[PDB]
Design a protein around this ligand. Structure first.
Ligand SMILES: *[C@@H]1O[C@H](CO)[C@@H](O)[C@H](O)[C@H]1NC(C)=O
Lengths: 51, 51
């Protein structure tokens, strides 16, 4: 449902992202990949956390 | 002396014209029953934006 998401974000008019304190116990946070090279080396979706 | 009197036929001719269009404007109002929803509760996207 890519069309429905693109419309509601467009009607919102704000990409404001408030980071919250999620307690991920027992899993490794902040995974990176080769295709998502950000800056020097591997990077991540800025608003997503890979467990 | 001085008198005043109205002409019935000319006044009636004007009233017959206006009453004719007054009927033309309020005649047979559309009758609609089960339609679509127009006020919505939460975001839905593609279908909601079209509704
Ligand atoms: C974006 O969201 C809010 C702006 O109100 C702020 O608290 C947060 O630090 C911002 N972060 C970035 C990366 O711009």
């Amino acid at each position: 449902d890519y069309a429905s998401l693109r419309s509601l974000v467009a009607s919102s008019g704000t990409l404001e992202f408030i980071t919250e304190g999620f307690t991920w116990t027992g899993v490794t946070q902040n995974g990176g990949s080769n295709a998502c090279k950000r800056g020097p080396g591997s990077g991540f979706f800025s608003r997503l956390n890979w467990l | 002396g001085t008198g005043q009197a109205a002409d019935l036929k000319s006044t009636q001719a004007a009233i017959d014209q206006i009453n004719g269009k007054l009927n033309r404007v309020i005649e047979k109002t559309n009758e609609k029953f089960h339609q679509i929803e127009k006020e919505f509760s939460e975001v839905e996207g593609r279908i909601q934006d079209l509704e």
